[PDB]
Copies of this chain bind each other. A is one copy, B any other.
């Protein structure tokens, strides 16, 4: 059986940017008159644990990534265009 060693689990779970699949409407809530394809996008976002309830995992560097996304108005045409999304490039455990 493969067992993940403690120090590896700890390092791999600690606060860091991790690819996270995010629904486009979480980021563009006012665009719900459209259907988007794909409907979700992979974004780097802070995730994981700090193992100290006085601390939270928060971004320390942010930027935007642009992706080609198809926009559909039901029963009308499709159009592919650029959409930008917030990413987290660096993460740290900071006091809450």
- CB–CB B38/A13 < 8 A: yes
Could you show 27 A-B contacts with beta carbons less than 8 Å apart?
A: A1-B66, A2-B65, A2-B66, A3-B66, A3-B67, A4-B65, A4-B68, A5-B68, A6-B67, A9-B38, A9-B69, A10-B38, A12-B42, A13-B21, A13-B38, A13-B39, A13-B41, A14-B38, A19-B19, A21-B48, A21-B49, A38-B48, A38-B51, A39-B51, A40-B48, A40-B49, A42-B48
Copies in the complex: 2
Distance of A42 from chain B, by nearest CB (Å): 5
Is A59 part of the contact surface with B, judged by Cβ < 8 Å?
no
Is A80 part of the contact surface with B, judged by Cβ < 8 Å?
yes
Query: Count of A residues near B, CB < 8 Å?
Result: 33
List residues of chain B with CB within 8 A of the CB of A69. Answer: 6, 9
